[PDB]
Structure formats: structure tokens, C-alpha cells
Design a protein around this ligand. Structure first.
Ligand SMILES: O=C[C@H](O)[C@@H](O)[C@H](O)[C@H](O)COP(=O)(O)O
Ligand SMILES: O=C[C@H](O)[C@@H](O)[C@H](O)[C@H](O)COP(=O)(O)O
Lengths: 647, 650
């Protein structure tokens, strides 16, 4: 789950400082549920650090990182005051899967009883059964039940069979990954290559942060196959490197990062960073706009609560630099090039999973309205199962907060093979979907740390609307509609705040459903997505059977569930479907239903009155009371909203 | 909502023979609405039946028809022994979608406290509020909250301001429909016009049955405009049967006159005339609307799927040469292949039929296939083009949203195809072409054979669209042999009825059940979930298997009942992963799988078939499960609560 390594090269740090840095990185990567963490570093208490680089020491522990930190400072014969001019430390937090949680099964995994090679690993090796046999036949005995130990044992096998006494650490890892199958991100450390690090990935994210008070030789590292050919400080040697599986563990130290790509072998040798391959392409040193405050709870007791209540801000962040209300223009920079190509295409296909799919349903109508193109919205897993027909004049959008969901990513590659124009709507710089799409939009909602999608849904929503507004900016007959929608976006942050000020009314509703085992959420049109997304939130966070029902489908069967006992929530807004929803309401009440109504500004039982906005934006306001409802219900029932129950 | 009126002209019927005929005609229509019922006949206890036509009697009550039949009998005022040589009685069962199903809101409505004009209405008047404020000013008091009372209070307003002392009943009705907006199918009765019935329609079904041992004067009633009427030649004996459906008339005769929009039929002096036709024979046997030896229509229709599947393929599938021919589409297939997209539009189970066949349609046509819920399709003003081919799946052929979607697509120049189970329905008439699935009448409220016959019908279309591809010949043979073997496999599934019933005894007490599937069985878990909702009232929900890991799986614990559909097709490995996830969450799921397929100790093994046909076999256990659960919970499978069959209005 979480990888972190800290390499100080001619930046003196005490053993304490190094360990504090490693512990701190794991906390950035530590999400609720992890149950195994460890650190690897140079042992020995020789005042001169150059003699302690032949004893790798491991401290691994089951439980939360807090427990690891206590074990660190709780070491008998370990002096934390030794200063290292050069040192590499690696760290890992995990959610034990393959084996049972235990100190042995925690990372790093070692190559022998003297820790000649150690590795931290994110992912799974498919052929790990076969590899363990090949090494055992060569005498290597295993101590863990994890697939990671095979990696540590295999790199020593390559070392034990090297042709020359100076075969590079890179060459060894190159030979290792060539024998691995599956997905992995790896960081290696060895006594035979003191101060050096090797990081490589295949289908699992791995990035490198860099920091130095000196000028760096380049901002675009060229690839070396098997002058400024590598990255290094120019004035002096001092530099710091940060390997990590997520930017959250690097951003507090530096915002200059390199995102590795599949089969890259990045190595730090003599403090200089190079990137090797076997196959002028290069890897860019880029600046992240992320900042530490964005991954902290602040004054909120949970990340779910923070991300719900900060949606006024995240919606604004989504629009910053992209909307101009002075002259009613929208400019998504990532699409200003392909914008005219897109309009020459004949169909829009939105492909996503879960809540990201709900964002497509939530904006499908306005996309049809403003683009006038057919809009198909697909669940990624079903899209793949059916081998859906795709053509060269299709424009395919891929909605993904993480930018890594397997089905959404495989759908992307499916559509690229067939020649379709691909567009990524993501919330994670460097992610796979953001790279492999022809173009894309970063929704810029800030990191989503909570288990459930809250601000990501609303920012995706706003992003797709902004795209719809770009697609009709040349239509005279639509100028008024664009103006109306855009003045809605202008007012939206304050309308969200207005909804959040009704939190007390949502708590009251939560206590009325406290003991209920089901609830039906009914909507149609613009609020079909709203009732589907609310039902998912209440399933995922509250663990009760909430179900979204298309209002127009009631009389076709589902209405049989309505009686005096079945809780019902109906979304009834003042748009063109208003009279129809009034009909559905009369149908529910006719069958002894006592429903709660989320209705528009100044429209049977309790009513949650949200403010009135443009019809194609109401979904953003109407889903928030459902977000809060799931939150408050879970809190009432003693659940930790930040502790996932999916796994 | 059902309509039924009995007009016996010069055929002596006692007051019990007519009342037992009105109720008998409502039971034939009860599945269209069973929230209330009523009847309208002549009162008075005078031997000379001529001195009784001036006294109307209304008997309306809340509940099914069996609640009305008991209200009609055991009365202390109605003498059921008066011989009527000429009499007219109107009846009606109501689907109270709004308000209470009270007797005051049921039909026949009335125009005053003396009942001068009573009307039975099927449909909605889109301007009854405007008609209610006009009549309230002229001196008319309203009692019910329905829109039908504005039709009764209005036919009397045209009678209170006529021009001649003897204006025909047609004239009065013709003036009413001119002030009525929306759809309606009416059958009037007045004391001023004894024995005369008027039957007009507009966007709603309405036919007139005729029985007479004497020769009928003609077989093509000429539509008139404000040697003309249908009647027996020599004698006067004739019995008419107004009704909004053919099942309530077939029992008495198979000679009906299907009216058209704005045709103002009228029976005067026992002569049927149309104002502003073709007397034809019905092609339906009474056995087709009889439960037989089954205790419910739903059970019969499930166990008869081996037959209805055969009927859907009869005369259309030849297994010796592997050819498929649907007459309704023999010519259009040429132009359909030149089109660029298929759109399937339907509601409920009919929508599931499209989900169930979407993949194979994409496979064999190579065209994009979009499946749309009719109500949402209309809400979004979905883009449609001239080179779209739009299919409309409707068992009844009258579902409002599906029908409006049709007219939407026709307005945009699309090619429209109807997949119905009702000849003469609106959807079958107004589409460019179509197919009659020919599954027989479906009486149970929950669709069973209609689903599997639609499924089979869409596959047959797919087989036609690829009959000229060399590369797909083997695939076509694989599918068609699957169809050949399908009836017997359905019998093999049905033989597990008892095993399904035992499972039901383990679930009837639960509040919720999750049904999971993917690929070809996404539709299966959606349709099964809908059925369990509809007749059992359990909170059953279908969950796409591939979406479990994205949130819903958090709802699974050792207590949540789970049904999974794991079949030996290309999603088997994926479905095995979903099964592992469910168990990891402590779920103890029931698995529907193939015979040749573990932790699962609660399995339902269906026979293995072609992947794109397996949905037919996998859904049947869920049909049976829903049936058995509803029995265990003391519910009626034929008359589920809060709804009826065929949604023909808003
Ligand atoms: O609360 C819902 C979850 O956030 C989940 O449904 C999520 O939306 C999907 O797993 C797709 O995630 P991505 O947006 O990263 O693809
Ligand atoms: O059990 C389900 C019901 O039968 C219902 O969902 C029905 O399928 C729809 O009302 C479609 O009706 P039509 O097929 O007659 O259009």
C-alpha cells in the first residue's frame, strides 16, 4: 500500500532524524486499517558513518505506525545520535492480504539472515509460486508467507551469479523484474551498494522527489538504454531524494517530483539519479501544486466530514482559471486543442465505475443538450464484458478520481486500440488514465483522503458541465442558456454553504432513520444520479440497504414496497419534471407512504429545502444532504466513517 | 382499469343473469385494476320492465371485484327476479393511482343525485380542472375528486342546452368529447335514452362484441359524418358486449368491432352504428385465459414457458437449414442493416429484456446498441436521428411512456420496430414494422413468459442480421441449436420447483436480499430483483457483480442474504472472484450455476446452454423463488399491492 524511502546524500542527518523522517512518511501513507509497517536502515554505532554501511537493520511491527515509532525509540543497543553524511532508509505500511499480519510478514523483506538485500513492494507477483521453487532448488530458504520475499531472494541470486565483480545494482534489478510477472512498485537497498537506491515499477505508481539548495543539472531526465545524462546538483554534492508510492509523503519536503513509468529502472549512484530501460524520450521533473495542508483533517474529526464541508472551496478550485464570468467564457486548457476535433466526432461515451459513473449519469442530459451528440454512459466492467462496439469517430471520456481503477483503465486501452479519441477526467497528477488519454482535465478538487467520494463527485460534475459549455460556445441560439448555467456556477459556492447550514436538519433526519434497515431514494431526470449516488453513500458508509429508484419506474413494480413502514426519500425539484414528480409523490402517499422530501427552494412528512439553482446544477446541491445523512447515520451507530469495510 | 357493459336487446335476462354477467366481465379485466369496482344497471321492481328504465342503480365498492360481487348480492331492495327483455348495464374496475379507492371515486360516475347520465371512463382528461370550474358556475355540484365526474357533469350540460327535443345520444356525446382533452374510452348510459349505449374512444382501447343466432346484416359498419347499421336481419335478438379488452368478450362470443380514435359508436334500437369498421373474428381460445389446473395465473405462465417459447419460434425458425424468418421484418432488414445504431426503449421487465440481449445484438449486428428506460428517455430529450433503428418492447403495446417514446422517435425520422404481445395495440400499429412475440395472453400482473418470449424474439432478430456473414455461420448454428434444445431445458429447470420452494422457506422471513450478476446475467439479477419486489414485497436489489468492489460490497455480512448467478461463460473467473469477495465478507450466498460447475452448500444447478441464451434458464428459478416466497408470506401472486398490469397512463 505505502512505499517511502529517504536518501540524504551529503546532507548530514542523525539516525534519529532519518527515522523520524521515515516514520513521518508512513503516516502520510497510513490510512485507517493498515496493520503492518517497518523500516530499514544502517545499523552499527560507529561514530564514523562510513563503517556502518555494512549492517542493514530492520525494525518491523504489526499494528499502526504509532506502534512502530514506539518500537523505534525502544531499541536497546542503538544510538540515535550517529551522524550520516550519506544514508538510505526505506519504509513501508501495508494492509496484510496474502499471509497473516505479523512482524515477519511485514516489509521490508530481506534476502538472507544478514540483510544483504532488502526490498519494499507494492502489489502482487503472479508467478511468485514458481519463483519460490526455483530459488529453493538453489538452497535459498524462505521465512515469510509473502510474495515479496521472492524478490529479495531473487536479487541475491542474480548477485550470487554475476559475471563481473562490478555489475551495477541496476543490472541486477533489471534481471529481477525480467523474471517477475504481475504488478509491482519496488525500492531496493543493499550492503553491496551502500548509499544507492534502485526503484522500478510495472502497473503500480512510484515517484521520486528531489531537493537541493543547489541548481539541478536538468528538469528532463533522459532515458539510458542497454552531456547532462542524469540528474544531480551542480555546485556541490548535497541533495535529498524521496521515493514514494504517493505524493502525500513527499509534498512537505519538496514539490519537485519525477513520475516513473512501467519498466523504468531509476537508480541513485553517487548521489546522481538516472533512469534506465532495455528497449529522445525522457522523464520530466515537474512541480506539484499539492500542499501538506490538503491531506490533513484540520479541525474536522474525520476526512469524510472535511471533504463534505469544504465542497464550497473544492468547487471553486475546480473552476479557477477556467471560467470567466465577465464575458461568459469557459476554457479547459487541456481541451482547447482537441475541441474542434471533438465536435467533428459523432458520439460521446462516458466510462467509469461507482460514483464516477454517477457523475456521468448526473451530467448526461446537459451534455446531450449542449453538444447535441448522442451520449452513452457505461459502467466500465460491463463495457468490457460486452466488447462494446467503438469507432474512430467516438470521443470517450474516462472518469476516475484515482486515475488507476483497473476496469476504467482497461476500457481506456480498449478504446485506444479501436482508434477513438480519449479524454481523461481525473484528480491525480501522474495517474495512468491522465497519461494514456490523448488529453484530459484535472478536476483539481484536492486530494480525496476519505473512503467515499464526496468532493470528487461534485468536482467531476462541475468539470463535465464546463466541457459542455465549451462545446456550444459558437451557437447563437444557446448564448442565453450558457449565461444561465454560468451564473449558476458563479452562485454555486454560496448555495453549497447554504445547504451545509441545514446540517442540523439532516441530523434530525438521521435520528429518525437510526433504527431503520432500508430506505428508498426516488428521483428522476437530473436527480436520477442524485438518488443513485445517495443510495451508494448510505450503503458504503452506513451499511444499511439504501436503494435508488427511478421515479418513472415505480408503477412498473417497485411501488409494491411502499407501505406505512418503508422509509422513503424523494427528490422533487422545480424543473420540467416537477409535475411528474408530484405524480410519483401522490402515488407514494396513496399507498400509506410517509416520505421525506428534498425539494427546491420554497416548493408530506419532513422536507429538506435546498436553494433553487439552474436545473442542470441542482444535482450538486441535492446530493449533499444525502452525503451528510450517511455521515450522521454512521456516526450515530458508532461507526468510523474513515475506516473502510470493503478491503 | 377495465370496462365491461352488457346490452341484451330482446333477449330476456333476469336481474341476476345481468349482474352475474357484469361481474363475470370484470373478473376477466380485474388484472388491469383491482383497487375498486362498480356496476350500473336499472332499478325499480316493476314486472313490466318498461317502467324501470327511468331508475338507475349504482353499486360501487372498494376492493377487488370479489368485494363488489358480495356487495351486489345480499341486498334488501334489489329484487333479482325481474325479467328484462331490453336492458343495459355498465361496469368498471378502477386502478386508483391517486387518492383513495373509495366508492365515490370509483366508476360509473354520475351527473346528479338522480343518475341521469352515468359514464365509465378509462384514461385521463388533461383539462378536467378547467371543466370543473365551468360546470360549478352553471349550477352543478361535484362530489368526487376524479376527472371522470367532469365527463358525467358535462354530458348533462349538453343535454340541458340542446336545440331540438330529440337530439341523438351521439350528438350529446359528440359535444362532450369536443371539450375533453387527453385520452379516454367511454361508455355512457342515460335514463332519457333507455337501452341506448354510446362508445367513443381516443388513445384508449374500446371494442364492441356482438352475439346473435340470426344473420348479421353486414361485416363492415360504414363510418358516418354529422344499410348502415349492424343488426340481425329478420328478428331483434342481439347481445352486445362493450369492453376495453377482448378477454371479457371471448367467453360470450368471438365477434367484435375494434373502434378507432374519434369513432362514436352507438347502439340504438339494437342497431350498432358508428359516427364521426369491420366485424371480425377473434383468434383467441378461452383456454388461453384459464388457469387450468394451476392455482394461479402466474404459476401457469411460468410453467408454460416451454410452450410459449415454442410459439414465439413457430413458423419462424427452421433447424434443418438454420434459417430465421420474421415476416414482420422480411423486407426492412435490408434497410435496417444500412442504419448505424439500435436503440431499445421500454419499461420494467420489458427494459430488462433489452439488457438481457444487448450483448448478442452488438455481437451479431456489430452496431452500437443503446438500451433506454422510456421515462428517462423522454425526460432527457435524447438525441435521435434518421439512421437510428428504434425498438419498442411492450407486452401490452399500450404502455404510455414507451408509446410516447415511439412518437418521439417517429417525429425525428427514425425507423421504428415494435416488439409486442398484443395485436392491434398502439405500439404494434404505429411502428413501421414489428414482431408479435405470440406468447399468448399474460394475465398475471408480473411478466413471466413475456420476458422470455421477448428475449427469444430479439435473439431471432439478431440471427437474421448476420445470416450473410461467413465468419458467423458457426456461431449462428450454435445459437439456433440452443434454441432447439431450449424448451426441454426449461422443463429441466421447472423440475427443480420443490428445491426452489425449500430455499424460499429459508428466506421468507428476511427483509432484504442482494442478487448479483454480470455479463449476460446482469439482466437476470435485475429481473429477479424486480419480481421479488413486485409480488413478495421483500427489499430485493440487483447489483452488477463488477461494481461490488466499488461500494455496495460493504453491505454484505453474515446476516445479509445474497444470491449470485455464476455461469460457465467468459465471465466465470470474474464471477468466482466476486464469490470469494462475498465469502470474505462472511456472506453465505445461494449460487445459481451450471450443472457441470466449492464453499457453496446452497446451490441451484440449471442446465448448461449457449452463453447468450443462459439468461432464459437462470431467470426462471428467480421467478419460482418469488412465487414461493409470496405464498409463504401469505400474499396473492396474481394481485400484488400498489399496482396492476400495463401502465397505460401517467
Ligand atoms: O464512494 C464511492 C467510491 O468512491 C467508489 O465508488 C469510486 O467512485 C470507484 O471505486 C471509482 O473510483 P475512481 O474515481 O478512482 O475511478
Ligand atoms: O413484472 C414486471 C411488470 O410486468 C412490469 O415491469 C412491465 O414489464 C412493464 O410495465 C412493461 O409493460 P409492457 O411490456 O406491457 O410495456
Amino acid at each position: 500500500c505505502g512505499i517511502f524511502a529517504y536518501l540524504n546524500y551529503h546532507v548530514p542527518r542523525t539516525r534519529r532524524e532519518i527515522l523520524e523522517t521515515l516514520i513521518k512518511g508512513l503516516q502520510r501513507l497510513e490510512y485507517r486499517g493498515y496493520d503492518s509497517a517497518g523500516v530499514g536502515f544502517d545499523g552499527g554505532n560507529d561514530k564514523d558513518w562510513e563503517a556502518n554501511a555494512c549492517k542493514i537493520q530492520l525494525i518491523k511491527k504489526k499494528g499502526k505506525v504509532k506502534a512502530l515509532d514506539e518500537e523505534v525509540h525502544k531499541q536497546q543497543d542503538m544510538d540515535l545520535d550517529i551522524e550520516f553524511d550519506v544514508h538510505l532508509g526505506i519504509a513501508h505500511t501495508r494492509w496484510a492480504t496474502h499471509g497473516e499480519p505479523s512482524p515477519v510478514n511485514s516489509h521490508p523483506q530481506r534476502s538472507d539472515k544478514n540483510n544483504e538485500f532488502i526490498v519494499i513492494h507494492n502489489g502482487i507477483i503472479t508467478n511468485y509460486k514458481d519463483l519460490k521453487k526455483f530459488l529453493e532448488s538453489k538452497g535459498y530458504d524462505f521465512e515469510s508467507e509473502t510474495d515479496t520475499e521472492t524478490i529479495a531472494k531473487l536479487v541475491k541470486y542474480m548477485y550470487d551469479n554475476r559475471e563481473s565483480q562490478d555489475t551495477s545494482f541496476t543490472t541486477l534489478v533489471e534481471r529481477v523484474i525480467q523474471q517477475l510477472e504481475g504488478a509491482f512498485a519496488l525500492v531496493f537497498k543493499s550492503v553491496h551498494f551502500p548509499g544507492q537506491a534502485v526503484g522500478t515499477r510495472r502497473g503500480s505508481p512510484l515517484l521520486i522527489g528531489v531537493r537541493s539548495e543547489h541548481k539541478l543539472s536538468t528538469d528532463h531526465i533522459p532515458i539510458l538504454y542497454r552531456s547532462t545524462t542524469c540528474l544531480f546538483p551542480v555546485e556541490e554534492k548535497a541533495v535529498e531524494y524521496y521515493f514514494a508510492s504517493d505524493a502525500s509523503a513527499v509534498i512537505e519536503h519538496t514539490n519537485r517530483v519525477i513520475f516513473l513509468e512501467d519498466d523504468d529502472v531509476a537508480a541513485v549512484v553517487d548521489g546522481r539519479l538516472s533512469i534506465h530501460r532495455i528497449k529522445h524520450p525522457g522523464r520530466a521533473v515537474q512541480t506539484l501544486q499539492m500542499e501538506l495542508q490538503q491531506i490533513m483533517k484540520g479541525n474536522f474529526s474525520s476526512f469524510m466530514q472535511k471533504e463534505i464541508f469544504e465542497q464550497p472551496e473544492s468547487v471553486v478550485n475546480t473552476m479557477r482559471g477556467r471560467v470567466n464570468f465577465d464575458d461568459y467564457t469557459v476554457n479547459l486548457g487541456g481541451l482547447k486543442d482537441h475541441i474542434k476535433e471533438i465536435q467533428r466526432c459523432r458520439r460521446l461515451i462516458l466510462i467509469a465505475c461507482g460514483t464516477s459513473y454517477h457523475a456521468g449519469v448526473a451530467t448526461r442530459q446537459v451534455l446531450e443538450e449542449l453538444t447535441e451528440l448522442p451520449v452513452m454512459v457505461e459502467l466500465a466492467s460491463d463495457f468490457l464484458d460486452r466488447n462494446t462496439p467503438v469507432f474512430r469517430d467516438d470521443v470517450c471520456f474516462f472518469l476516475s478520481q484515482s486515475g488507476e481503477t483497473a476496469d476504467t483503465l482497461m476500457g481506456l486501452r480498449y478504446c485506444k486500440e479501436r482508434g477513438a479519441l480519449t479524454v481523461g477526467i481525473t484528480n491525480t497528477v501522474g495517474s495512468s488514465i491522465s497519461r494514456e488519454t490523448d488529453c484530459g482535465v484535472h478536476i483539481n478538487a484536492g486530494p480525496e483522503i476519505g473512503v467515499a467520494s464526496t468532493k470528487a463527485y461534485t468536482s467531476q460534475f462541475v468539470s463535465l458541465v464546463m466541457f459542455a459549455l465549451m462545446m456550444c460556445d459558437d451557437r447563437i441560439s444557446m448564448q442565453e442558456r450558457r449565461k444561465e448555467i454560468m451564473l449558476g456556477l458563479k452562485r454555486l459556492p454560496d448555495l453549497i454553504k447554504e445547504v451545509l447550514s441545514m446540517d442540523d436538519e439532516i441530523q434530525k433526519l438521521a435520528t429518525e432513520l437510526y433504527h431503520q434497515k432500508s430506505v428508498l431514494i426516488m428521483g428522476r431526470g437530473y436527480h436520477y444520479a442524485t438518488c443513485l449516488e445517495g443510495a451508494l453513500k448510505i450503503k458504503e458508509i452506513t451499511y444499511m440497504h439504501s436503494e435508488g429508484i427511478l421515479a418513472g419506474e415505480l408503477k412498473h413494480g417497485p411501488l409494491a414496497l411502499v407501505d406505512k413502514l418503508m422509509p422513503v426519500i424523494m427528490i422533487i425539484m422545480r424543473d420540467h419534471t416537477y409535475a411528474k414528480c408530484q405524480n410519483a409523490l401522490q402515488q407514494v402517499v396513496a399507498r400509506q407512504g410517509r416520505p421525506v422530501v428534498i425539494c427546491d427552494k420554497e416548493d408530506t412528512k419532513r422536507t429538506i429545502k435546498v436553494p433553487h439553482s439552474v436545473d442542470c446544477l441542482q444535482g450538486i446541491l441535492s446530493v449533499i444532504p444525502l452525503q451528510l445523512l450517511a455521515f450522521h447515520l454512521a456516526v450515530l451507530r458508532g461507526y468510523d466513517v474513515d475506516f473502510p469495510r470493503n478491503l
